[PDB]
Design a protein around this ligand. Sequence first.
Ligand SMILES: */C=C\C(=O)Nc1cccc(C)c1Nc1cc(-c2cccnc2Nc2c(Cl)c(OC)cc(OC)c2Cl)ncn1
Length: 298
Amino acid sequence: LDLPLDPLWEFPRDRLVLGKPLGEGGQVVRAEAFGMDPARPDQASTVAVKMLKDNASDKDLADLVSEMEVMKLIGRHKNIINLLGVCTQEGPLYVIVECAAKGNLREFLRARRPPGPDLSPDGPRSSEGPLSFPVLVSCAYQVARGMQYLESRKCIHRDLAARNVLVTEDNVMKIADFGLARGVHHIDYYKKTSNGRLPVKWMAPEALFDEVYTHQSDVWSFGILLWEIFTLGGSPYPGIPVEELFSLLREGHRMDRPPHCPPELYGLMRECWHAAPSQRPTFKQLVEALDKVLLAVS
Ligand SMILES: */C=C\C(=O)Nc1cccc(C)c1Nc1cc(-c2cccnc2Nc2c(Cl)c(OC)cc(OC)c2Cl)ncn1
């Protein structure tokens, strides 16, 4: 290709060993990288690599270039998936990002649900599941801090959801795909994903009905994500098909308070779903409110 060389970010492609596919449409693969830190040139790390497939158009190339450049602009934060390097010279375009070992937050939560109540005899910690209330609040706090950072860089996510938050080996939350092209003028609202998700159920009403996105549209989505956290990966608006969702949103319907969820947290959810965007909290306010809950842990 004739892509310009950016020495700040270029990484030698022969220091990558490509491995297992992580997603395909182009594709993302898991890889081992050697010397991502130039101070440790022989040290291995595990990364995710985005690339085009042989079919790709000039438009697909421009889209991946745009995604690479937006990640350079937005800069680094602990609670987002960060750009690590690019391979633009002498070979196919690769964009290399952090790889979160524990997968996405929806699956992380669902896999850590306590078992059913009559499966096995009681034991020393049978009343404890893996996930405690302060760790659930911390997950929410970390996503709010990531979104506050992205907002400060003028980034509207437009699909914020537990499936788009990834979990590291140390249980750090990292927002995924914040610079991904989302084709907002051609959304199939009835679309169900391969894993059963109906992404329309995370859209703020002004985005769904009026095609308007602001940072306060992402606050609505954050409220849905808070509900996913405190249902340990539940699916929003259970038992409501998309046709009925349209009708219920026009009537002001909101999800019920989940079980085992304190009123402080359902309170925050309902603030995030206030009809008027200006009457929803900001991400700065959400960070502060969740910080106070964390500091009140015994
Ligand atoms: C790190 C080891 C591993 O296998 N992790 C793993 C296994 C299963 C499932 C997941 C989610 C993960 N962790 C991931 C996955 C991805 C990923 C998966 C599919 C598509 N994209 C991405 N990452 C990605 C990419 Cl490649 C770009 O490219 C520009 C931008 C992104 O957001 C900014 C993201 Cl999230 N990524 C990290 N960990």
